Amino acid sequence: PLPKPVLDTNGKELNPDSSYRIISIGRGALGGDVYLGKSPNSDAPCPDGVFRYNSDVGPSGTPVRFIPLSTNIFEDQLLNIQFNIPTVKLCVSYTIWKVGNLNAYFRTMLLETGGTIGQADNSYFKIVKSSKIGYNLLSCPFTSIICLRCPEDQFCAKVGVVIQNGKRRLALVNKNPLDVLFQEV
Amino acid sequence: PLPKPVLDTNGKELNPDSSYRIISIGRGALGGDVYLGKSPNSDAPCPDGVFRYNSDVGPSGTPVRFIPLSTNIFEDQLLNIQFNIPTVKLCVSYTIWKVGNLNAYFRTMLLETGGTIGQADNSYFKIVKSSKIGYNLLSCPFTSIICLRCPEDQFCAKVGVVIQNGKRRLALVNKNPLDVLFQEV
């Protein structure tokens, strides 16, 4: 390869200082965009959970920006994600996407906000062409730990959805990842 | 291969209901056995940290047992580890080895007790021949999550040591893993 850029919904390359909604390929009740929601069982003072609505015949997603290593947004390269919105003074920190501690009930890690930019921690994701249609999100937590004999020595897993309190919570999964697209604003 | 068994310090295969000390190949202040210590900053009611002494000219390690998938203890197969000792009624749970949440200061996960047996969670380890001399411990957390294109789809990392409050705390590392041996009791 060369590095392959990630594309808008219209075809335009992704711009580090434009904001996009993550939208789902599914049409119907089988669809709904990514948004920032309050976690049913969080003790954070801010909304800190990454969900997606139950149907696309409702609100639009919360817009996000992407922050690559540098300098453009390519497929298959570590990058931060961050909801791009106004927030109360108390919540400015709870917008940068992050993957949380192991959750025993779901047997996986959930996506939340409260991460950090440009640090080898739990805030690094990847975009990749899906297998069905479009793109998938990947989570590469623990970049700062050698994954033995793994591609580029890194742990990576597919982003998908679990049902937490009847809402759709984004989480690391094994089957059925969330196929998505990126609609500029 | 066939499956290769793990050996005692005397040569005898490892027995699921015998207990061993994890001892270090280093001689001197360069040595010290694995033990169960109180974590300087834990809010657990029980000692819950996996350390190793600063010199071998001191106390002996806390003995452990091993619990394989089944039925014997081989190299390179998921297995639980558990300090095999008497405990107050309140602490019976804080003996089974486990790897903890990401620690931001050390940029890695630390070893603690409080795990569980026979469950695809944060309590699974592997034994493997080292590269220098003897054996190493491996940590395979998140067995219940597909590691993309990884050997057997699993995240694995080398067990080693960080210095937490001047004591030696076992942790996942990248270089210099802890070379160990197993001395029956």
B89 in helix, strand or coil?
Answer: helix
B76: left (phi over 0), alpha (psi -120 to 50) or beta: left
Burial B79-118 (b: 16+ CB within 10 A, else e): bbbbbbeeeeeebeebbbbbbbebeeebbbbbbbbbbeee
Please answer yes or no on whether A174 and B122 come within 8 Å at the CB atom: no
Q: Do A148 and B156 touch (CB under 8 A)?
A: yes
Are A109 and B148 inside 8 Å of each other by CB?
no
- Inter-chain CB proximity B174 and A146 less than 8 Å: yes
Q: Which residues contact B21 (CB under 8 A, 6 or more apart)?
A: B33, B34, B60, B61, B62, B63, B64, B182, B183, B185
Q: What's the topology of domain B1-185?
A: Trefoil (Acidic Fibroblast Growth Factor, subunit A) (2.80.10)
Residue A78: name the closest of A117, A129, A133 by CA. A117
Is residue A108 within 8 Å of residue A161, measured between CB atoms? no
Question: What are the helix and strand counts (H, E) for chain B?
Answer: 0, 12
CA angle B117, B119, B120 (to 5 degrees): 135
Question: Rounded distance, CA A84 to CA B45, Å?
Answer: 42
CA torsion B31-B34-B37-B39 (nearest 10°) is 80
Half-sphere exposure of A86 (CA within 13 A, CB side): 0
Contact call for residues A65 and A80 (beta carbons, < 8 A):
no
**Start-to-end Cα distance in chain A:** 30
- Taking an 8 Å Cβ-Cβ cutoff, which residues of chain A contact chain B? 101-102, 104, 107-109, 120-122, 138, 141-142, 144-151, 155-158, 172, 174
Sign of CA dihedral A44, A47, A49, A53: positive
> CA neighbours within 13 Å on the CB side: how many for A113?
28
Let me know: does B134 contact B181? Beta carbons within 8 Å.
yes
Rounded CA separation B100/B162 (Å)? 14
Helix, strand or coil, per DSSP, at residue A90? helix
Distance (Å, whole) CA A48 – CA A92: 11
Give every CB contact of residue B169 below 8 A, 6+ residues apart in sequence: B49, B50, B51, B110, B111, B161, B162, B163
What token pair was written down for B170?
Answer: 């076992």
* DSSP state letters, B5-37: BPB-SSSPBP-TTS-EEEEES--STT---EEEE
A83 and A92 Cβ atoms separated by less than 8 Å: no
CB burial of B12-43 (b: ≥16 within 10 Å; e: otherwise) equals eebeeebbbbbbbeeeeeebbbbbbbebeeee
Separation of alpha carbons B66 and B19, rounded Å: 8
Q: Which residue of A has its CA nearest to B141?
A: A102
Strand ranges (DSSP E) for A58-166?
64-68, 79-83, 97-103, 108-113, 125-129, 135-139, 157-164
How many Cβ pairs closer than 8 A exist between chain A and B? 74
Report CB contact under 8 Å: B148, A144. no
What DSSP state is assigned to residue B74?
B
Question: Beta strand pairing status for A64-68 and B79-83?
Answer: unpaired
Q: Which residue of B has its CA nearest to A108?
A: B145
What is the Cα B10 distance to its own chain's centre?
20
Cα–Cα distances (Å) from A117 to A68, A122, A138, in that order, read 10, 10, 17
Method used to determine the 3D structure: X-ray
CB A142 within 8 A of CB A152: no
Q: Which of the residues B78, B124, B155 would you substitute to probe the A interface, choosing the one with the greatest number of A C-beta atoms within 10 Å? A: B155
Contact B25, B181 (CB under 8 A): yes
Q: Do B150 and A145 touch (CB under 8 A)?
A: no
Find the largest Cα–Cα distance for chain B. 45
Task: Measure the CA–CA gap between A146 and B155, rounded to whole angstroms.
Answer: 9
Distance between start and end Cα atoms, chain B: 30
* B147 contacts A147? CB cut-off 8 A: yes
Site of tokens 């850029």: A5
**Does the CA dihedral B164-B165-B166-B168 come out positive or negative?**
negative
> Rounded distance, CA B87 to CA B93, Å?
9
Nearest to A141 by CA among A117, A160, A159, A120: A120
For residue A132, give how far its alpha carbon lies from the nearest alpha carbon of chain B (Å): 17
